Amino acid sequence: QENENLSKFCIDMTAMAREGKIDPVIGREEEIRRVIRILSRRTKNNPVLIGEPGVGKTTIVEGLAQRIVNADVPDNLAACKLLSLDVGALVAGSKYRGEFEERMKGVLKEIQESKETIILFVDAIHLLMGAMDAANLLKPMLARGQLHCIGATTLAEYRKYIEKDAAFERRFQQVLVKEPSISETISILRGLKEKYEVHHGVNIADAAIVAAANLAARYLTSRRLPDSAVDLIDEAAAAVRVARESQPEIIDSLERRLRQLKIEIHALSREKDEASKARLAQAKQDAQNVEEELRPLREKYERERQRGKAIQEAKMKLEALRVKAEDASRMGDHSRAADLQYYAIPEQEAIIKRLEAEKAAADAALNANGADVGGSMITDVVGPDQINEIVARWTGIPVTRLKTSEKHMEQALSKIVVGQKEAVQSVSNAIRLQRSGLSNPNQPPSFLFCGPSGTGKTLLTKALAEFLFDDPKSMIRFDMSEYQERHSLSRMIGAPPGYVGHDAGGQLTEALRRRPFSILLFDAVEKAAKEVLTVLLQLMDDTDGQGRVVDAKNCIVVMTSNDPTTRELVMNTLRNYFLPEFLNRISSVVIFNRLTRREIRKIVDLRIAEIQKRLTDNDRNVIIKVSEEAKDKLGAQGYSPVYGARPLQRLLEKEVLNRLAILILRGQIREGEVAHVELVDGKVQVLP
Amino acid sequence: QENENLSKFCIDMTAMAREGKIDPVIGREEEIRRVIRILSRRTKNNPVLIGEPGVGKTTIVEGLAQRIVNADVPDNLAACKLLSLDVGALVAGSKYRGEFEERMKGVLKEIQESKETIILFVDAIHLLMGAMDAANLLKPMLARGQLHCIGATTLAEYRKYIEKDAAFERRFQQVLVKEPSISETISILRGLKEKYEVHHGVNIADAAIVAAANLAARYLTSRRLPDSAVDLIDEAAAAVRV
Amino acid sequence: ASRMGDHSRAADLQYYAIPEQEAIIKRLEAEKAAADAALNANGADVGGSMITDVVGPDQINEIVARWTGIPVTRLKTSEKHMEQALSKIVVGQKEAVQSVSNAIRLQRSGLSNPNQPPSFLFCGPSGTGKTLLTKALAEFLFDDPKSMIRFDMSEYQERHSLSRMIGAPPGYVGHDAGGQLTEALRRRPFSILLFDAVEKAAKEVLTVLLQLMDDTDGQGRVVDAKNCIVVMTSNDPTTRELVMNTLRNYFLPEFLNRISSVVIFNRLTRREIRKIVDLRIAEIQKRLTDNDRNVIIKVSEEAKDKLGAQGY
Ligand SMILES: Nc1ncnc2c1ncn2[C@@H]1O[C@H](COP(=O)(O)OP(=O)(O)O)[C@@H](O)[C@H]1O
Ligand SMILES: Nc1ncnc2c1ncn2[C@@H]1O[C@H](COP(=O)(O)OP(=O)(O)O)[C@@H](O)[C@H]1O
Ligand SMILES: Nc1ncnc2c1ncn2[C@@H]1O[C@H](COP(=O)(O)OP(=O)(O)O)[C@@H](O)[C@H]1O
Ligand SMILES: Nc1ncnc2c1ncn2[C@@H]1O[C@H](COP(=O)(O)OP(=O)(O)O)[C@@H](O)[C@H]1O
């Protein structure tokens, strides 16, 4: 009937469903079959697909309505119309008081009168009320009008605006969908590689995608897997188009000098002082040979390029095949079903002919490609490597860990963190239990990092954060004495049993998920009212079928506390603090070392080799030299058990550095002059 | 074909590109090359250039087609037409209910029917949905009409109106282009010193620009560095003429 | 000629074409001798110049000098040290100015440039100079005095009103709620930052201060940044230790070390107060000498001794 407020403000997700524009969502059979039976309840009969942006909670309804027009839907409301009310178009609606609800009330009778057997997907459903956007119109219409709809927005906004009254939850039961794994994406990414390779015109052999979605495993969870794998893979298909088709520069820059000198012979045939004749012969015959050489490739390669446009069309040809039979039987009108399909699908097989030649043609221009220094013609063959650069270019340092594990941690952790001989070892020895798969228990890799009040407890947390996962933003650093006792300790909210992040603010509750592959740390052992201390226990070592609740977390955890003798002292002074059960249920409790000479001396090398980086990374190049005589003033002042080793940096500035750049601005040490610093009384410089 | 709804409301950038009126964009090879590959995606295939006012994010669309009309572009949609849709040009003459969308409705089929391989960089693209300027016509168009466009508005206008729903992000991924520094300006003012010495009739030895772009370093970073510096330098080359 | 593929006029036009370039050097030989020799002829008596086509480091300087600020003072400084100005303008805080001077030269010089900006815990008596040192240096570490956004932390005392001030959330920058910080991170690039009441921190802004001072989109679809110099304020090392431990009742011990040097302000004495008495009459002569009339002002110590003690 009328489709106006439908059509101009919402799009039918059954249009591309009967048609086939929308990419065929393959798996997800868990949520698809359910929402059918949810939308068929008496109570809680409007499913809400709450989840992250990319999990497929629009793809869910995209594959939901797909198989509704084709085959599978109960003859109770089968092969009907589902329209996606995209409210982003009503967000920016006309101007005055309301002027959105009056346009909304138009959608209402449209759906109430024009064939009531109609479903509605709605994107970012919370905004219709919570926002100015008011959706007060549900109360009779969800009862009297009996509309059928599916929401799609993160439950974080379900916890905000979808629980206002009884009509809110009693009419919408929430359908949880959170994240597919590296093996769940690849499985669902197997079926949608069909649609995403053709819009680009590329053929990947196998290993770009496994390199892709498993690189999308740990890094671009910032924009997590199911829409970052397809974002990433679009670029890997989009990488080669500008590569194979751009007629490689090895050819294109070669011909600009040729036409420079060759076409010059044309007009140079006019009578001038005949110092021109020599340039004719020199530009005729030196440019005549090079003519013969570029003539084969720029055609026979562009003949391979000719097959490329021919095959992309040769494939997009087959697109019309599947859309025909689906509608041939959709209405049950086989008057055109059989007669149209018989002719030839082997347009598929009428095209290998182009492939037989081109296959020998991709690498034979490479076969011909070698005469001098080594240029590379990238053709359509994007591979395990071809994806690695996109990670390398966009996300982080170039391919170092990508190609390391594809085709041991101790030496790296210790050439960066010099102390704690067995501690790094014990951490490494306990970390290989979890990430390898040897034994996977309920608890994450828990550590009670206890040591002297400073010099390395959180420091070992940084060195492994780069190597148990990658990012340094995956550490939320805190001190337990920021929220000393019960009240301010109850302010920090990590994971309440029923609600996660409802009302009160914590850097933990949803920040559990803000850093998935991450470390966690809190530094003040003595600040615990022994209830947060225990809800820690039931979250480390210890969900909705229809219970209507959610909670989870998994990462690595290292608890911090500001020759086993003093251990038992701590163990029993931690008996004066903790429960005996607690001290065994985390892990082998691990201990940090004190400050000595040999460890302090190499960190002096680590702060002058660092001060050389911030010297070498800028413009000027000034060479730095320091002997033991100046070193022994700060070396003893450096290891400071009463405060820590952070005073190394403070008095490095207050003693070392401020007497350094002064001589650059005074004129004693220039950029080519060497700076020596000796200590007799006040550690002054010299240049002997 | 017909150029009315195009020409009287928008300017085809790629005109001067063939000619050389548009000043040659020098560096920025990072942002120029990508939007090609962005506009070639399946998902997030319409670049939105969020950045600061003057640093050079229309040169980017100017140097894109430049090295496209001269030499370099894959044979997939090469040396085609990009037009600068100035929505300020749709403001005049539109008074009644709409009177803008009907002038939009003219731009739509003009680009969908007359040689579909056509891109449009659009200035302050946020205004077409954010502003009574409405670009609600996307929903069939970015899907059925499959247009090729590049937005330009400071991320303040992306954070306002370019995040309404998924079609905003799933079709527009934002291309950050922020600011070429004093040695990047000298680098970007290196390549654009050719064009700016003749319109004024001046010969600078070296030290006007390094003193200027490094004096606009700290003071006229107010409005921005490379376009208060290339403004400033137009004052210093225009200084001598009088 | 090659833009389509028809080279019917490509070469024929270019062959005899290019020599115009070399036709303009003949003219140049003369004109070069003509630009500054007309300058050579200009001198017989006093008072006059020739300005020719030669726009230069100076020729731009006036545009800076005329347009942007006071005339050419800092432009020609480096062309052919901070204490005397800072101290002849801000008379107290002997080592504080120095310690500020000693810690500021780490960043803007390039000797060592860490993730954190030149952070300062500007702490001193609750008044008489806390924000005062901030103005004199802002004019010399960068240029504008509008590059100072002043606020008070007890204007937004505790958590809720503290959550109103939005400085830099992890994903969105300045999206919905109003704060004088989020995009004001970018409003003042060459700038100072300061807030005076540390104790109004619920220890979440304090650490997102820390995690933003001490620490963006490849494909993550997110943005955040800020960088300037920062000076943090709090309303014979004895009482220092008191602070360092009374700051334990407030801050985290880690926090008190991640700011490079904690720096201290001095009290009010006679010699520091008496030169500021001279600095308010040397200004009152400026606002006397800057207008039309000329009235000379003289006051003895006896009148000064009423307000001198009432002054500090
Ligand atoms: N069953 C499925 N089969 C194939 N692809 C799927 C499936 N479910 C989800 N997807 C993927 O989800 C992506 C789109 O995510 P989207 O629908 O925007 O998520 P959401 O609706 O949660 O924001 C597509 O790139 C598609 O590859
Ligand atoms: N193993 C180590 N190697 C080098 N430097 C260290 C080491 N442990 C601590 N530091 C120094 O300690 C400072 C930070 O103190 P930290 O050890 O992080 O205290 P906490 O771990 O209690 O937060 C850093 O500046 C760093 O130079
Ligand atoms: N890659 C580049 N090539 C040439 N000029 C540039 C480049 N980047 C910045 N510029 C400078 O920025 C100036 C104007 O920037 P424009 O491109 O008009 O920016 P916006 O629209 O952000 O205001 C140009 O005149 C040029 O002087
Ligand atoms: N070293 C100084 N030199 C000059 N004036 C000073 C100095 N210290 C304090 N003052 C005086 O302090 C007043 C400003 O107080 P201020 O210290 O800025 O308060 P707050 O730091 O709480 O903002 C000015 O009127 C000025 O006369």
Numbering used by the authors:
A (entry chain A): 173 to 303, 311 to 586, 591 to 725, 729 to 748, 766 to 891
B (entry chain B): 173 to 303, 311 to 421
C (entry chain B): 507 to 586, 591 to 725, 729 to 748, 766 to 842
From the paper:
HSP100 unfoldases, a subclass of the AAA chaperones found in yeast and bacteria as well as in the mitochondria and chloroplasts of higher eukaryotes, employ a powerful mechanism to recover functional proteins from aggregates. Upon forming a hexameric ring, they unravel polypeptides by threading them through a narrow central pore. To avoid damage to native proteins, the high unfolding potential of Hsp104 and related disaggregases needs to be carefully regulated. This control is mediated by an inserted coiled-coil domain (M-domain, MD), which assembles a molecular belt encircling the hexameric particle and keeping the enzyme in its latent state. The Hsp104 disaggregase is composed of tandemly linked structural modules that build up the N-terminal domain (NTD), the two ATPase engines (AAA1, AAA2), and the regulatory MD extension.
Here, we present the crystal structure of Hsp104 from Chaetomium thermophilum that – although forming a helical filament – reveals important mechanistic features. The crystal structure of the double Walker-B mutant in complex with ADP was determined at 3.7 Å resolution. In the crystal, CtHsp104 subunits are arranged in a helical 61 filament rather than forming a defined hexameric particle as observed in the recent cryo-electron microscopy structure of ScHsp104 or the crystal structure of a related HSP100 unfoldase, ClpC. Although the obtained crystals are formed by the full-length protein (data not shown), the NTD was not defined by electron density, likely due to high flexibility. The active sites, located at the AAA subdomain interface, are defined by co-crystallized ADP molecules, which were clearly visible in the electron density map. Importantly, however, the crystallized filament seems to reflect mechanistic properties of the HSP100 hexamer, as the architecture of the basic building blocks of AAA unfoldases, the so-called rigid bodies, is comparable to that in both ClpC and ScHsp104 hexameric structures. The present crystal structure provides a detailed picture of the resting state of Hsp104, shedding light on the regulatory role of the MD. In parallel, the MD binds to the neighboring ATPase module by docking the tip of motif-2, particularly Arg509, into a two-helix cleft on the edge of the AAA1 large subdomain. Strikingly, in the crystal structure of Hsp104, the PS1-hairpin protrudes from the AAA2 into the AAA1* ring, where it is accommodated in a deep pocket close to the ATP binding site of a neighboring subunit. At the tip of the PS1-haripin, the side chains of Gln732 and Arg734 form specific interactions with Asp406* and Asp410* located on the sensor-2 helix.
